[PDB]
């Protein structure tokens, strides 16, 4: 029935289907390094007639130091990004400083929680890996769900084939990870999740923060990841 | 396809042409206690029978008061009857404040019957299932009554659901009340209606039959707890 | 079977959503109140089965004001909402008019809030006080019927206490006369012993016109008279 | 006439309470003592202790005694519930369905016990019929084997009736005990 | 939200059962302090602090350890922390635990009575201070009921842990003795992992946590007490 | 008498746990050892190892043992599930639905084992009638082929009964295990 | 005992997957070589290639082999899905419906193959019964025609059974292949 009604088991229905609706969406990888947080993506290819060179709809920008990698309904994702950009700017307008991500996910999971509680509207079939840098506790990487129960992490692989890709980060991840070593680490889990051995490079997109006291937050071009893809060939950080 | 589709909604109409949800309210007033009023030439008496639910309980009130010359007697559910009493009280009192003359009787019931109408077309609010009985006197003593659907009938005698058929038949052959100008014969004639229409082998009137009179030099004087059992509740 | 709507009628002239709550009030703790010529005495149980409770935070006899005390039954979470509303309007009445509110004027407003047409409040009360014209005791229902009672009982065991009061109520009974009577009906319908903790009587005397909760010390001298 | 009828309603009520508090529990222990639940598997419903077979005859005879006691006890209890059904009204009658459910299950058990009499007549008829075929065709050994195999089946069938007997008494008693307030006072 | 044909509430009993599938949380009162306890679980080598999923503060003297829906506590706590500070702005006093619990219970009750609103599927327990130097641990359910306790527990299989606490609950205990009693409540999570139990010692109107160092010194003693 | 009855409810509970933790798993492995799941196709359901047919008789004798032990175990389990259903109420009775589904499956498996007793009687009766015709009409060869085919039919049914037995035993244990919390508590 | 039980759970799962990857595709090709889909109409269901009928006898024996192997293959597959049914819950149980649909489809094919053993007995019993009547009434010619038509009927029944075998094997495999992600983890 509607989202307002419960179930005899204690769970819900609309928020339970949304948790499964994101399982049929492309994967995204999160990863905290010793230099800055990095993200992964999977451009689902409906055809070869997309631009494939200027845009990508799996990783967006929230602020100059906060960025998320969305995974789920691409249509409903644009609303929360248009809603998180306001909270990331209304905090600046009210406190003259950057907003900590710990105070951003709370501000954004409440907008999801408010939908699965009243109004009689459908929930948000979206879940994303939102990370950033802050002066209070350094780099961080949070993860929201359609219910709102956010939680901090070090590496997450939501989308399709989560349990397999998350297991890769259980062993291959290390506490100390450089920026270049972290990219190669996140490159293999992004490729083996799609049951392939090498990315076609006209696929997956990556992003990285690495605050150099100014939070550069550079994204990646189709030519910049070629050098990263070539480094995977020689040094294979295999499935295992 | 019939008998269960056109039954629970105040909006749908039956294919025959009857609003069956409102029609249940007209029958909902029949489960209440009886009441009867007599319109004489210059006086109006209302006899109401209360209902003692238990031996330890007290009989709940039936006959109410609205103004000095206006008093109603509900017959149905106490939930909606109390709401219409407050609406009729705030309406008539506002007329004595906004202006100085008393409120016209038919111009008052037109506002009360309109209250039923407003709670009939909206899907949310249901209909007031209560049979009102407005007895008043302004220049000629008139007796009005409503139903769940908006209605007015300048009745001369009535009954309300308990043993109404046994009481309507008594009033059909008793049309000499207009010339029974003596108040004593009127209250005995009105109480005789309940005595000949009470339940089988029940207590006649053991101080549990509310009585009220209103007339020319009479305001809504509730019959005291002593004037009725001395001779009125002792003639039969 | 007509149960979808909240305001639907019946072909026999009856309500449906209100009648569902009529059986919900028969599951709470039992209570009994007696209206005597000198005042009003109330009584109730205290289901504090788990000894870890504080035993004072859970109460069955709250107060509408200093002159009107009442009982509770049914949904305890909804009973507090009506009592909180009664504590507002009765106190709001004292701010407008300097005299204390009448129970006939207070029970009529506690019943109009059970006419939300949400859902009807599944709670029955035993509002009693000594406002004016001596002491009065009223018993409300979720349907809105406000019947003034001389001695009634509400709770899961209200059926047994009903016939007991009919064979025991006398009009010329004082406070100490009914105080033992307010416990003999509780001694019958009780799955425990009438100790000094399970009973929580309180009364409103006509002299001081205020209510006073009978503490643990005062009830011990009344539960040991053995009716 | 009015007196005899009111006397009957009193007589029913007495018999109903008497049967549930005493008559039914004693028989529960009785049949349980005959087929104890703690036995290991295969030691009860077996054929190890197995003209007409006079030995088998006595076991069927005991069943009919047990069958008689079951139909008589439940029938008055069923009638008692029927006399306790409130006036038919619209809404708030979930409990009459429970009452109806009890009568339905009670009638089911009654019909089940009633069918043993029909099942028992069929046994003698089939056994006699097959035996005629054995006399007419004495060398086809399967007819003689069928008679032998038949005795093992009926012996088991007698025993399956007893386990179902035991189990039905408990299912009836447990249901009435838990739902005692609504069967007597459905409000 | 409507009633049931017998008298219950299908939208409340479902929500009350929804808290049973959640992490357990146990609280325990003492003389002048009240140590709390909660048992959570986390994925190894990931999710470093669990964003302080339990033992939420409300004021300088009011801890709160909920149980149940983790996502539905944020709206409950934010609608509470606001009221805990709003009371301080209108009465110039730090909000007592009696008022916060009376507010959290009114929040959940305001969600089941209204229509078209899902009830708060979360059962909590608030441990704070009253106006005088006292400590009364409260406990609220999704139905709206609330009562103080001397020890209480909610969550997955809360009956077997509350039953154990009903037997060996002493009256007044020591700071380490009261912790050991709360640490003897690992009857929900098997093998008693130190990375699962979290306790905080609310004392002298100043909340503080308990480091894992002294946890191992107390969680290991339980294994050498069953023999 | 009140003590003996309460003892019975206690006695049931003991027997049920013992059967689910030991008696039922042991039989799963037992029947599996006769018809292993790892066998290649066609090596089980064949007729290579095949007056009355004494060989089929011996196989049926083992079946009757298997049938007896199955019905006895489920019957106390069925009653045990019946003893844990709470008082009938309107709403919040999701657990009785779980309970009813379990009772339904137990009765279904019981009917399956129960039908073996009736099916064995049918084999000997049907085989004998055709054989009489063979004696009367010895050159119509289809009657002799009918005898042959009947044994091949009965041989297949015996093995299909054992596999269905085996598969039901694991399916019963696995089903009760998953819904165990609702099986023990009433509501 | 706990070890022996868990060991069984491993052995079943292997057999089910093994049947779908090798046993089932091989039979698809097998039955197609006997009744090719590309055959012209009437070239399959004919009587052109036609005491007891020894010619008819040899084909039914092969049928019983085909029927046995089907029940054995389907029976373990059916059992495997049963151990994979999740705990019963109210709502969000769309995946149990596929499983329910799967047990129904597997049991339907299984019941169909199972009834052939009883059906074969009916052929010989009926043919023998009519043959007795031929001995009693040797000049009523329809009885001799009756012998001919029954064999033609059984021959047709044999062939419709083999196509149904082929068609059942592909419909089972095609259903499971398309719904593979939902059958294992519903």
Short mmCIF file of C-alpha atoms in Angstrom, two decimals, chain B:
data_model
loop_
_atom_site.label_atom_id
_atom_site.label_comp_id
_atom_site.label_asym_id
_atom_site.label_seq_id
_atom_site.Cartn_x
_atom_site.Cartn_y
_atom_site.Cartn_z
CA UNK B 1 -24.50 -5.61 -9.26
CA UNK B 2 -26.38 -4.13 -6.30
CA UNK B 3 -27.07 -4.13 -2.52
CA UNK B 4 -23.52 -3.31 -1.36
CA UNK B 5 -22.00 -0.74 -3.71
CA UNK B 6 -24.31 2.24 -3.18
CA UNK B 7 -24.26 2.01 0.60
CA UNK B 8 -21.16 3.50 2.29
CA UNK B 9 -20.56 7.06 0.96
CA UNK B 10 -22.52 10.29 1.33
CA UNK B 11 -21.88 11.17 -2.31
CA UNK B 12 -23.03 8.22 -4.42
CA UNK B 13 -26.68 7.85 -5.37
CA UNK B 14 -28.56 4.63 -5.82
CA UNK B 15 -29.70 3.67 -9.32
CA UNK B 16 -33.23 3.86 -8.00
CA UNK B 17 -32.65 7.43 -6.86
CA UNK B 18 -32.22 7.24 -3.10
CA UNK B 19 -29.32 8.53 -1.05
CA UNK B 20 -29.02 5.44 1.12
CA UNK B 21 -26.42 6.88 3.47
CA UNK B 22 -28.68 9.74 4.53
CA UNK B 23 -31.67 7.37 4.67
CA UNK B 24 -29.93 5.43 7.43
CA UNK B 25 -29.79 8.57 9.55
CA UNK B 26 -33.56 8.99 9.31
CA UNK B 27 -33.86 5.50 10.75
CA UNK B 28 -31.10 6.19 13.28
CA UNK B 29 -33.44 8.54 15.15
CA UNK B 30 -35.88 5.68 15.69
CA UNK B 31 -33.56 3.91 18.12
CA UNK B 32 -33.94 6.75 20.62
CA UNK B 33 -36.59 7.34 23.24
CA UNK B 34 -40.05 8.72 22.58
CA UNK B 35 -41.18 12.34 22.75
CA UNK B 36 -44.45 14.14 22.07
CA UNK B 37 -45.58 17.75 21.89
CA UNK B 38 -49.04 19.31 21.83
CA UNK B 39 -49.81 22.62 20.15
CA UNK B 40 -52.78 24.30 21.80
CA UNK B 41 -54.19 27.68 20.86
CA UNK B 42 -51.86 29.67 23.12
CA UNK B 43 -49.57 27.08 24.76
CA UNK B 44 -47.20 24.30 23.76
CA UNK B 45 -46.29 21.44 26.08
CA UNK B 46 -43.49 18.95 25.37
CA UNK B 47 -43.43 15.55 27.04
CA UNK B 48 -40.13 13.75 26.89
CA UNK B 49 -39.31 10.32 28.28
CA UNK B 50 -35.79 9.92 29.61
CA UNK B 51 -33.91 6.60 29.71
CA UNK B 52 -32.42 5.24 32.93
CA UNK B 53 -29.57 3.08 31.65
CA UNK B 54 -28.88 1.57 35.08
CA UNK B 55 -30.25 1.57 38.60
CA UNK B 56 -27.26 3.51 39.88
CA UNK B 57 -27.40 5.90 36.95
CA UNK B 58 -29.49 9.00 36.61
CA UNK B 59 -31.84 9.61 33.68
CA UNK B 60 -30.06 11.61 31.01
CA UNK B 61 -31.75 14.84 29.99
CA UNK B 62 -33.96 14.93 26.91
CA UNK B 63 -35.72 18.30 26.92
CA UNK B 64 -33.34 21.24 26.64
CA UNK B 65 -33.62 25.01 26.66
CA UNK B 66 -32.50 27.47 23.98
CA UNK B 67 -34.09 30.80 24.89
CA UNK B 68 -36.89 32.07 27.05
CA UNK B 69 -39.53 31.14 24.48
CA UNK B 70 -37.59 28.47 22.54
CA UNK B 71 -36.84 24.97 23.79
CA UNK B 72 -35.90 21.83 21.88
CA UNK B 73 -36.13 18.13 22.68
CA UNK B 74 -33.68 15.86 20.89
CA UNK B 75 -34.41 12.27 19.91
CA UNK B 76 -31.46 10.30 18.61
CA UNK B 77 -27.74 10.42 19.38
CA UNK B 78 -26.40 12.75 22.06
CA UNK B 79 -23.23 13.36 20.05
CA UNK B 80 -24.73 15.43 17.26
CA UNK B 81 -27.72 16.76 19.20
CA UNK B 82 -25.46 18.67 21.57
CA UNK B 83 -23.63 20.27 18.65
CA UNK B 84 -26.88 21.53 17.16
CA UNK B 85 -27.91 22.88 20.54
CA UNK B 86 -24.79 25.04 20.78
CA UNK B 87 -25.30 26.18 17.20
CA UNK B 88 -28.87 27.09 17.99
CA UNK B 89 -27.87 28.80 21.22
CA UNK B 90 -25.12 30.93 19.71
CA UNK B 91 -27.46 31.85 16.88
CA UNK B 92 -30.47 32.99 18.91
CA UNK B 93 -28.34 34.77 21.50
CA UNK B 94 -26.57 36.66 18.74
CA UNK B 95 -29.94 37.84 17.49
CA UNK B 96 -30.74 39.34 20.88
CA UNK B 97 -27.35 41.07 20.87
CA UNK B 98 -27.01 42.27 17.28
CA UNK B 99 -30.59 43.50 17.39
CA UNK B 100 -33.08 43.76 20.22
CA UNK B 101 -36.09 41.83 18.98
CA UNK B 102 -36.40 38.11 19.55
CA UNK B 103 -35.41 35.72 16.77
CA UNK B 104 -38.18 34.59 14.42
CA UNK B 105 -38.91 30.90 14.84
CA UNK B 106 -39.04 29.94 11.16
CA UNK B 107 -36.02 32.12 10.50
CA UNK B 108 -34.17 30.13 13.17
CA UNK B 109 -35.06 26.65 11.97
CA UNK B 110 -34.04 27.75 8.46
CA UNK B 111 -30.55 28.20 9.84
CA UNK B 112 -30.64 24.90 11.73
CA UNK B 113 -31.92 22.95 8.74
CA UNK B 114 -29.20 24.59 6.69
CA UNK B 115 -26.68 23.12 9.13
CA UNK B 116 -27.86 19.68 8.08
CA UNK B 117 -27.49 20.65 4.45
CA UNK B 118 -23.85 21.73 4.85
CA UNK B 119 -23.09 18.32 6.35
CA UNK B 120 -24.61 16.40 3.47
CA UNK B 121 -22.74 17.36 0.31
CA UNK B 122 -19.22 17.21 1.66
CA UNK B 123 -17.64 13.77 1.51
CA UNK B 124 -15.74 14.17 4.78
CA UNK B 125 -18.46 15.30 7.17
CA UNK B 126 -21.37 12.90 7.64
CA UNK B 127 -25.00 13.75 8.31
CA UNK B 128 -26.33 14.59 11.76
CA UNK B 129 -28.41 11.60 12.62
CA UNK B 130 -30.77 13.26 15.08
CA UNK B 131 -34.43 14.12 14.94
CA UNK B 132 -34.81 17.62 16.30
CA UNK B 133 -38.03 18.89 17.82
CA UNK B 134 -38.19 22.67 18.10
CA UNK B 135 -41.11 23.92 20.15
CA UNK B 136 -41.52 27.64 20.55
CA UNK B 137 -43.96 30.52 20.75
CA UNK B 138 -43.55 33.99 19.30
CA UNK B 139 -47.01 35.20 18.25
CA UNK B 140 -48.84 31.92 17.61
CA UNK B 141 -47.28 28.81 19.19
CA UNK B 142 -45.71 26.75 16.41
CA UNK B 143 -43.85 23.44 16.54
CA UNK B 144 -41.12 22.65 14.05
CA UNK B 145 -39.01 19.57 13.47
CA UNK B 146 -36.13 18.51 11.27
CA UNK B 147 -34.73 15.29 9.84
CA UNK B 148 -31.20 14.53 8.51
CA UNK B 149 -32.20 16.10 5.22
CA UNK B 150 -33.32 19.72 5.41
CA UNK B 151 -36.98 19.87 6.34
CA UNK B 152 -39.56 21.89 8.26
CA UNK B 153 -43.10 20.93 9.07
CA UNK B 154 -45.34 23.14 11.20
CA UNK B 155 -46.66 20.12 13.04
CA UNK B 156 -49.49 20.07 15.56
CA UNK B 157 -48.40 16.87 17.39
CA UNK B 158 -45.58 14.40 16.88
CA UNK B 159 -43.75 11.28 18.07
CA UNK B 160 -40.17 10.05 17.88
CA UNK B 161 -39.12 6.46 17.20
CA UNK B 162 -39.70 4.39 20.35
CA UNK B 163 -43.41 3.61 19.97
CA UNK B 164 -44.21 6.36 17.50
CA UNK B 165 -46.77 4.27 15.61
CA UNK B 166 -48.69 3.58 18.80
CA UNK B 167 -48.41 7.29 19.64
CA UNK B 168 -49.20 8.66 16.18
CA UNK B 169 -52.47 6.73 16.16
CA UNK B 170 -53.48 8.30 19.47
CA UNK B 171 -52.86 11.80 18.18
CA UNK B 172 -54.63 11.09 14.88
CA UNK B 173 -57.97 10.68 16.67
CA UNK B 174 -57.27 13.38 19.28
CA UNK B 175 -57.57 16.68 17.43
CA UNK B 176 -59.46 18.56 20.14
CA UNK B 177 -56.23 19.91 21.64
CA UNK B 178 -56.77 23.24 19.85
CA UNK B 179 -59.80 23.97 22.02
CA UNK B 180 -58.30 22.50 25.20
CA UNK B 181 -57.23 25.98 26.28
CA UNK B 182 -56.99 24.87 29.91
CA UNK B 183 -53.34 24.00 30.53
CA UNK B 184 -54.34 21.28 32.99
CA UNK B 185 -56.26 19.33 30.37
CA UNK B 186 -53.42 19.83 27.90
CA UNK B 187 -50.68 18.33 30.08
CA UNK B 188 -52.98 15.46 30.97
CA UNK B 189 -53.72 14.93 27.28
CA UNK B 190 -50.03 15.02 26.43
CA UNK B 191 -49.11 12.66 29.25
CA UNK B 192 -51.93 10.33 28.21
CA UNK B 193 -50.15 9.88 24.89
CA UNK B 194 -47.10 8.38 26.59
CA UNK B 195 -49.26 6.32 28.97
CA UNK B 196 -51.06 4.75 26.01
CA UNK B 197 -47.81 4.30 24.07
CA UNK B 198 -45.29 3.16 26.66
CA UNK B 199 -43.64 -0.23 26.61
CA UNK B 200 -45.44 -3.31 27.89
CA UNK B 201 -45.75 -3.54 31.71
CA UNK B 202 -43.33 -0.69 32.35
CA UNK B 203 -43.42 2.00 35.01
CA UNK B 204 -45.81 4.72 33.86
CA UNK B 205 -44.22 8.04 34.92
CA UNK B 206 -42.11 7.63 38.03
CA UNK B 207 -40.70 11.21 37.92
CA UNK B 208 -38.65 10.22 34.83
CA UNK B 209 -40.72 11.92 32.12
CA UNK B 210 -39.44 15.43 31.45
CA UNK B 211 -42.14 18.00 30.87
CA UNK B 212 -41.89 21.59 29.71
CA UNK B 213 -44.44 24.24 28.84
CA UNK B 214 -44.24 27.53 26.93
CA UNK B 215 -46.87 30.13 26.07
CA UNK B 216 -48.24 33.69 26.21
CA UNK B 217 -47.12 34.61 29.71
CA UNK B 218 -45.01 31.50 30.01
CA UNK B 219 -41.29 31.31 29.26
CA UNK B 220 -39.54 27.93 28.82
CA UNK B 221 -40.62 26.88 32.30
CA UNK B 222 -39.44 23.38 33.00
CA UNK B 223 -42.13 21.55 34.96
CA UNK B 224 -40.76 21.24 38.49
CA UNK B 225 -40.08 17.94 40.26
CA UNK B 226 -43.16 18.45 42.46
CA UNK B 227 -45.94 19.82 40.25
CA UNK B 228 -46.04 16.70 38.09
CA UNK B 229 -46.32 13.90 40.66
CA UNK B 230 -48.93 15.66 42.79
CA UNK B 231 -51.80 15.31 40.31
CA UNK B 232 -50.40 14.95 36.79
CA UNK B 233 -48.48 11.74 37.48
CA UNK B 234 -51.33 10.50 39.69
CA UNK B 235 -54.41 10.69 37.46
CA UNK B 236 -53.51 7.35 35.84
#
